[PDB]
Amino acid sequence: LSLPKDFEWGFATAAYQIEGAVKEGGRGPSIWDTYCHLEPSRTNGANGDVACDHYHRYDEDFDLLTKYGAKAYRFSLSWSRIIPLGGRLDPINEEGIQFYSNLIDALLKRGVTPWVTLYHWDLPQALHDRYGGWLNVKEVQLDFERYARLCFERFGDRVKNWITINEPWIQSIYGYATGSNAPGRSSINKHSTEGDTTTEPWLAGKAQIMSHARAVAVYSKDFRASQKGQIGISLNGDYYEPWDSSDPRDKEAAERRMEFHIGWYANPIFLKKDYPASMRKQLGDRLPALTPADFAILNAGETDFYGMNYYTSQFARHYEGPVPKTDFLGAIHEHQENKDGSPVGEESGIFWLRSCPDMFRKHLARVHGLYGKPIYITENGCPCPGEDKMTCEEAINDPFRIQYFDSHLDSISKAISQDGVVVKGYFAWALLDNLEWSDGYGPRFGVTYTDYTTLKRTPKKSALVLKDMFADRQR
């Protein structure tokens, strides 16, 4: 299935998942440095102190981008590497700025377009200690504004494609509702934790929304015209079909779930409107109100594209009885089989991720019709069945991942040609195997195998054929 000739495709990584050098080059600790070092571990015994040691090995990793024929590469900047304490009054770390300046030059020298994520879950620990980080909507958005502006100043003459925040739903929900991600706050966690699942996720959500708003306002007012670049945000979220398509409650539950996951952020950011009515009906005063001053900032900037992180889909079933105050999904039940027992998709290397290419197409069409923005697939990928136990020699032949790429490229092509969706790019997660956050190094999402004993990179077959697949579809 065909794809446009201007389709900008490549591979994606994230700072804490690959860099290592956590206390090198002037870097300050992030909330994941603290979370990955809890004793006993809550991250399957894994930390990112070394990870892939990309900090010392980026010449090799970027040479792989040349071997794989990528024209673009998405990576993130460690906030605490650039401003170790993170705050707008704290000193900058020129050695950290220099490191990312070197990465940008290394990519451009190889003819690879750098795509830069400002925030990828690694909030500076000092901001959490000072005022609660994302819980302090007022303070954190000011620190993020300064941080974003600094990156525009130092890198914006070279970097023309910006992503403010990666998957804010996960940072809000896993960080402050379930507490399974850093900074590990919850009131429903099996560990003794501080927090409040009834309030804190919705504070973190609004904080990330207004942090995006201030950064986009800065970029629109001072950088888009002179630097001639674009800026977006990367939203995740599964597509949901009704568990029973004949049950009206199930059809409404699937839409409500996607409103709670994506509309939460996309309504104020892309449509300049309040949270979806379904969220405000369920959450009431626990959903921090967007003020007239908040909307004034949202209306003072424009976000250029919808960044889509997509992996899997599910079935949504209606919710009976009173909805607990700790509920955050939006009063549904999640399922991977429907009323007929039909699986939502094919099993992959990790239980939550199923390959559902047909629903990915409908996902794109729905997002297009709701928010009317061009879409870049900023993340899409998978681990393969049994890959966590595979040797390097076994993992290098990955027909499952190849077929995963092929299926979802078909969905994009159909969405463009049949649904009128403007999909302008695609970034495969990931360039190489890396730290899958609290799941450890077990899940291998890379098109490159990472031996963690020697740090040797070994390309998997998908890394070599992906450029052929795009050339064929662009032929």
Q: Cα separation of 11 and 392, whole Å?
A: 20
Question: DSSP character for 447?
Answer: S
Helices (H), 284-419: 292-298, 357-371, 392-395, 399-419
Sorted by sequence, the CB contacts under 8 Å of residue 261 that are 6+ apart come out as 169, 236, 237, 238, 329, 330
- 365-368 contacts at long range (C-beta below 8 A, 24 or more positions apart): 365/415, 365/419, 365/421, 366/239, 366/258, 367/262, 367/266, 367/306, 367/308, 367/421, 368/415, 368/419, 368/420, 368/421, 368/422
Q: Cα separation of 179 and 8, whole Å?
A: 36
Strand partners, 377: 308, 426
Q: Cα separation of 279 and 289, whole Å?
A: 11
Q: Cα separation of 153 and 145, whole Å?
A: 12
Contact between residue 470 and residue 412 where contact means Cβ atoms under 8 Å apart:
no
Furthest CA-CA distance within the chain: 60
Please tell me the number of Cα atoms within 13 Å of 434 on its side-chain side: 24
What phi and psi values does residue 219 have, to the nearest 5 degrees?
Answer: -65, -45
- Write out the two tokens for 128: 């959490």
N-to-C CA span, the chain: 10
- Write out the two tokens for 134: 């994302």
Q: Cα separation of 240 and 263, whole Å?
A: 14
Strand-by-strand arrangement of the 333-335 sheet? 239-242, 313-317, 333-335
- Write out the two tokens for 436: 């899958």
Sorted by sequence, the CB contacts under 8 Å of residue 91 that are 6+ apart come out as 83, 84, 85
Strand partners, 380: 428
- For residue 281, the enclosing domain spans 1-475
- Write out the two tokens for 173: 């929900």
- Write out the two tokens for 293: 């001053």
Contact between residue 4 and residue 474 where contact means Cβ atoms under 8 Å apart:
yes
- Write out the two tokens for 453: 């004993």
Buried b (16+ CB within 10 A) or exposed e, 138-148: ebbbbbbbbbb
In total, the chain counts a number of residues equal to 475
Return the closest-CA partner of residue 216 out of 271, 149, 266: 149
Contact between residue 270 and residue 308 where contact means Cβ atoms under 8 Å apart:
no
Tokens 């900032």 correspond to 297
Handedness of CA 308, 60, 382, 99 (dihedral sign): negative
The CATH number given to whatever domain includes residue 343 is 3.20.20.80
Number of domains in the chain: 1
Helices (H), 132-276: 137-155, 168-176, 200-222, 224-227, 248-258, 264-266
471 burial (CB, 10 Å; 0-12 / 13-18 / 19+) is: exposed
- Write out the two tokens for 145: 């504004």
Per DSSP bridges, beta strands 8-12 and 423-429 are parallel
Listed resolution, Å: 2.0
How far is CA 238 from each of CA 169, 170, 204, 362, rounded to the nearest angstrom? 12, 12, 20, 11
Contact between residue 272 and residue 306 where contact means Cβ atoms under 8 Å apart:
no
Contact between residue 112 and residue 10 where contact means Cβ atoms under 8 Å apart:
yes
Contact between residue 355 and residue 407 where contact means Cβ atoms under 8 Å apart:
yes
Per DSSP bridges, beta strands 113-119 and 72-76 are parallel
Q: Cα separation of 32 and 29, whole Å?
A: 8
Contact between residue 96 and residue 26 where contact means Cβ atoms under 8 Å apart:
yes
How far is CA 230 from each of CA 1, 7, 216, 272, 296, rounded to the nearest angstrom? 28, 16, 10, 18, 21
- Write out the two tokens for 364: 């794109």
Per DSSP bridges, beta strands 230-235 and 161-166 are parallel
Q: Cα separation of 466 and 8, whole Å?
A: 13
Q: Cα separation of 409 and 474, whole Å?
A: 12
Q: Cα separation of 353 and 140, whole Å?
A: 32
Query: Which active-site residues does the annotation give?
Result: 167, 379
The CB density around residue 108, as the number of other CB atoms within 10 Å, is 13
